[PDB]
C-alpha cells in the first residue's frame, strides 16, 4: 500500500477504531489509529489554522491548531521519519465525509522543507505558499472530489452550488513537485506546513476531518477511504 504520515484534524469520534470520544488532533504513522492525540475544540463555521513542524535532530513531529480568540490544541510524537518515509515524498492535504458531513475548505496552504549538508553554504530548500487557489492549478495534483478556484479556495470534498457539503466524499491535493526529506550528507533536515481551513456543517455532528500528509510520490486515494479513513488509509488497521 501507500506509506502515509499524517496530522489529522478528526471531527468525528470513531471510538471503535481508537478515536477519543471528542473531536481531536492526532499524529498518524502508517495507521488511522493515531499514535498520539489531543482534544480539539473544533468551531463549526470558523476559520482555523494548523501548524506542523519536524526536524531530523529532535525527530519529533508536532502540531498546533487554533482559532482566533481561543486556546490552541497541540500534539507531538517522537518518530524518526527517515525510518518511515522514503527519501523522496509528496506532501498534501486530504479530507473526507461519510454519512456525516462538513465542508473541508482550505483557504491557504504553505510548506517549507530544508536539507542542510556539511558542505559550507549548502542548503537545499523548497517553499510554496497558496493564499489563492485557481481553477487550473498546475502545481497541484487534485485527486477524487478535490477542486480549486471557487472563492479562491481549495474544496477538498464536494459542495453544492448553494454551498452545502455532500456526504460520502473524498478528495486530496498534492504539491506537484516531489520533496527531498533526506540526503546522505544532510546534518539537519526540517519541514514545516501551515494551512487555514473552514469546516462547516448544517449538522451537530460533523465528519470526518482534514489531514496534512506526507506520502510516497505515487500516492493515490485508497479504495473505500471515505468517512473515517480520511482519504489516507485502505483500512483501519
Ligand atoms: O535536494 C533537495 C531539493 O530538491 C529540494 O528543493 C526538494 O525538497 C523540494 O522539491
Ligand atoms: Ca474519526
Ligand atoms: Mn482520529
UniProtKB/Swiss-Prot annotation:
Annotated Mn(2+) binding sites: 8, 10, 19, 24, 34
Matches recorded under SUPFAM superfamilies: Concanavalin A-like lectins/glucanases
Organism this protein belongs to: Canavalia brasiliensis
GO MF assignments: D-mannose binding; metal ion binding; toxin activity
Role played: Glucose/D-mannose specific lectin. Has anti-inflammatory activity in rats. Induces histamine release in mast cells from hamster and rat. Induces lymphocyte proliferation and IFNG production. Shows toxicity against the aquatic snail B.glabrata at concentrations higher than 20 ug/ml.
Subunit structure of this chain's protein: Homotetramer.
Disulfide bond sites: none
Keyword check for Metal-binding: yes
Matches recorded under PANTHER family: CONCANAVALIN A-LIKE LECTIN FAMILY PROTEIN, LEGUME LECTIN DOMAIN-CONTAINING PROTEIN
InterPro entries registered for this protein in UniProt: ConA-like_dom_sf, Lectin_LegA_CS, Lectin_legB_Mn/Ca_BS, Legume_lectin_dom, Leguminous_Lectin
Additional information: Binds one manganese (or another transition metal) ion and one calcium ion. The metal ions are essential for the saccharide-binding and cell-agglutinating activities. Is being tested as a molluscicide with potential application in controlling schistosomiasis. The causative agent of schistosomiasis depends on freshwater snails of the genus Biomphalaria as hosts during its larval stages.
Protein name stated in the entry: Concanavalin-Br
Amino acid at each position: 500500500a501507500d506509506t502515509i504520515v499524517a496530522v489529522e484534524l478528526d471531527t468525528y469520534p470513531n471510538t471503535d477504531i481508537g478515536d477519543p470520544s471528542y473531536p481531536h488532533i492526532g499524529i498518524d504513522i502508517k495507521s488511522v489509529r493515531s499514535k498520539k492525540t489531543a482534544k480539539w475544540n473544533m468551531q463549526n463555521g470558523k476559520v482555523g489554522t494548523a501548524h506542523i513542524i519536524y526536524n531530523s535532530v529532535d525527530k519529533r513531529l508536532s502540531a498546533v491548531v487554533s482559532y482566533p480568540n481561543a486556546d490552541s490544541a497541540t500534539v507531538s510524537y517522537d518518530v524518526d521519519l527517515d525510518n518511515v518515509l522514503p527519501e523522496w515524498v509528496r506532501v498534501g492535504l486530504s479530507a473526507s465525509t461519510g454519512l456525516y458531513k462538513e465542508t473541508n475548505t482550505i483557504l491557504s496552504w504553505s510548506f517549507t522543507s530544508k536539507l542542510k549538508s556539511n558542505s559550507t553554504h549548502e542548503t537545499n530548500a523548497l517553499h510554496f505558499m497558496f493564499n489563492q487557489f485557481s481553477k487550473d492549478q498546475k502545481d497541484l495534483i487534485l485527486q477524487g472530489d478535490a477542486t480549486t478556484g471557487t472563492d479562491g479556495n481549495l474544496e477538498l470534498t464536494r459542495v453544492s452550488s448553494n454551498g452545502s457539503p455532500q456526504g460520502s466524499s473524498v478528495g486530496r491535493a498534492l504539491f506537484y513537485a516531489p520533496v527531498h526529506i533526506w540526503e546522505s550528507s544532510a546534518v539537519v533536515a526540517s519541514f514545516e506546513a501551515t494551512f487555514t481551513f473552514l469546516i462547516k456543517s448544517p449538522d451537530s455532528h460533523p465528519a470526518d476531518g482534514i489531514a496534512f500528509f506526507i506520502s510516497n510520490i505515487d500516492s493515490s486515494i485508497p479504495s473505500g477511504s471515505t468517512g473515517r479513513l480520511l482519504g489516507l488509509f485502505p483500512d483501519a488497521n
